[PDB]
Symmetry: C3
Subunit: 333 residues, 3 copies
């Protein structure tokens, strides 16, 4: 009793931004890519299931010469066991447990989910996490789920992609279409992260809450959160980098799914950094979004996503101020 799906997609994708767009939200040019993965689950006995998943990203916008591997990576690689009502345990490269909140708004046709950074403690995909999850409180409270996650230190060659040991968890409750969630994690920073000019402190912290309504073809969600010493940043003026001492983040989304397959979307996102060395307060992300995806069926879709960028041109860190529109065509299986 094993079921394994090989799965994947090919995404023709193009970004339009003015001139460069070295000063835009998303950039400019061909951004085509493809994903390949497997996900499998085996029924060991009536109460026990083993499972594994691996997912890889292959850029489609590189040449076949020396730059062939740019932006190619494993996204996920983990395996786990799930026991009757006791919970599931998995270990590997997987989603940070703060993403249990951030996933609420990470729903846009192309962009969005800006604070769910990869290899960034608990907000995005990350290496070496052991994750325990429980559904419906051991089978006793329908709708009430929680998780705890242990993050092992990754002392890598850059501060940006490193972390120390840490712990995080999440609790959520869902009831006839509504959902609420909170997630928090904290971890040591490594000596290399500390040596960065930007950000100061021995612990990283990230938290977020989420509210959503997801029924009757309507999708509405909001996320609010803060981080300490955890959001990666760069000052394009001094070419210095590191982490924001604090940030406060808000993300809102509203979508509707029409039976004929159109799914319009609007959204707002703002992330503001505070106590940044040599700057003080400074916006990281600030935009409105209008977009749509058209689903032809479960295997084919197309979309447009427009980021009306509200970052101003005198942003003190050099964050791009121009708009970006993406257009995509997607075959997936």
């Amino acid at each position: 009793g094993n079921k394994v799906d090989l799965y994947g997609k090919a995404v023709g994708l193009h970004y339009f931004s003015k001139g460069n767009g070295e000063n835009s939200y998303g950039g400019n040019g061909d951004m085509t890519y493809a994903r390949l993965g497997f996900k499998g689950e085996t029924q060991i006995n009536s109460d026990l299931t083993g499972y594994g998943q691996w997912e890889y990203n292959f850029q489609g916008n590189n040449s076949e010469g020396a730059d062939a591997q740019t932006g190619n990576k494993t996204r996920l690689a983990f395996a786990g066991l799930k026991y009757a009502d006791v919970g599931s345990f998995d270990y590997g490269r997987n989603y940070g447990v703060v993403y249990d909140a951030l996933g609420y708004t990470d729903m846009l046709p192309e962009f969005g989910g800006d604070t769910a950074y990869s290899d960034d403690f608990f907000v995005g995909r990350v290496g070496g996490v052991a994750t325990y999850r429980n559904s419906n409180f051991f089978g006793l409270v329908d709708g009430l789920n929680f998780a705890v996650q242990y993050l092992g230190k990754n002392e890598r060659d850059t501060a940006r992609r490193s972390n120390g040991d840490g712990v995080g968890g999440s609790i959520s409750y869902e009831y006839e279409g509504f959902g609420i969630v909170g997630a928090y994690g904290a971890a040591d920073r490594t000596n290399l992260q500390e040596a960065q000019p930007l950000g100061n402190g021995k612990k990283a912290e990230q938290w977020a809450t989420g509210l959503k309504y997801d029924a009757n073809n309507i999708y509405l969600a909001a996320n609010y959160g803060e981080t300490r010493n955890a959001t990666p940043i760069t000052n394009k003026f001094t070419n210095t980098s590191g982490f924001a001492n604090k940030t406060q983040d808000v993300l809102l989304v509203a979508q509707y799914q029409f039976d004929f397959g159109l799914r319009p979307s609007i959204a707002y996102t703002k992330s503001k950094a505070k106590d940044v060395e040599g700057i003080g307060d400074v916006d990281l992300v600030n935009y409105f979004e209008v977009g749509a995806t058209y689903y032809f069926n479960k295997n084919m879709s197309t979309y447009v996503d427009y980021i009306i960028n509200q970052i101003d041109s005198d942003n003190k860190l050099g964050v791009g101020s121009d708009d970006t529109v993406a257009v995509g065509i997607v075959y997936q299986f």
Copy 2:
């Protein structure tokens, strides 16, 4: 109604050239490799189909240490829609539209197709092309096909793999075994390509025609074409590089497919560069070919391909003059 094929091959492949063969057509040594891809198509309704394809090359002749990734790349990555008789549209990394002509002779057991360079405007696979294709003139003229293709600028880190914006197209007509085709495209060159010592001008151009007979187990084809500022070249003496101001190219092939599975092949190819800075005229490619593939069935084959190289030893750009023979064994699915 989705059909997706995972497909691939493992190719044990060895090249024999004298000494190095640093001065040969093809080189020398192990050239084993494998390909993995998917290709999928979904029937959206009776008249509309969505489709996607991704294909990757994994060299099999690298070690498992630092050189593990040499020559590994995505070859194709695109998705598209095809509507009743109106045409097909796809976007991504795909074959340049001049390959609609060059494919006629790109038929040898191992070598051949020399002017179908990758990441070279319209002659080979290339990034960021939007391609429209029409079969049988909207359903009105059986056998008459055309295409137009829009190439978005790729300002990459090398001249060799860069291009500016451009447009190309092709028209072909097939009738009881005979086929004729023409294709032309033109594009801006980028500032980096212009700064190269070899080749001068603001536009690249490539064109080719093709004639073939493909029936009764016979395959015969010829391609003639020219390029301006588009064929990549190197002078091994001065170690300078760039593009040939002009080239003129001819490719001929003849093959026969015996029912017992042997498919012998002979061929001629010559590509000559003109107005090369500091040289004038100079051959790029000039050889005869004799070879065969033996098909055991649709999944297994073996072949030998011998390139009787007619480049002379005093070639002014340093183009290799020695012969090369390849021997391959292929399992594919």
Copy 3:
């Protein structure tokens, strides 16, 4: 009549060693990874089969930034034909023919098989080998198998991953649960390998014998062998490297497979280098092993593997002296 299996596994894997473990057997930290491959065989006729295989390793312990590709590689890539009782021939990247002996002890839950180095002449996976194998002596002697293998020179950018031309072979005999095997190969060393400070001589040689009992849920095996100028080594003091002039190697393993799925393991391995320039004799590997794998079924397992490391802290080459324990969870298909 083609059968192709896509296959793979996701392995959550963690190593525990004291402090660094820069001075341990196995290291420390997340070592998660995934494998993807295909293996196919086509029945050409009643007596002839074609076959191909490709296998790749994707690390799961890298970040998605610049280090994304570390430790990623093709492990195997070859294709072949197998004729009735005459034998099989394949060419590509495959197991060196000395591994026909070393495979006997390469059976531990995580570690073990220490002398089966990759890209190391005939002991491990290697590029450009043509391998002929015969089962049951042409169909005439049940249980008696042999092989010969031709290794083409690989002049790569490092000594460690290079080799010259060579030949190796193996002969084995199996009879109601017992097996005996011998394998030997020799090859030229390349000029780059010769220029290394460690190891001196024009030929590499590697041989090994094996004995095993494999029946009634018992597994016992021993391997003994020697090498000349073939085992790669480093002196962490002088930061010099190359090959051991000689080594002598022994590997023992004993395991039991309980019907309920537990498979305990114990093992001993010692590899000693001799005539090392500026040192004389020096241990390379010396440990005992205790471990177990628990198989839930054919798709799911977990294991622990503990290396009681007997290398001392004053080892003259700087070989790590500390212990390592690994813990893994594996989903495979």
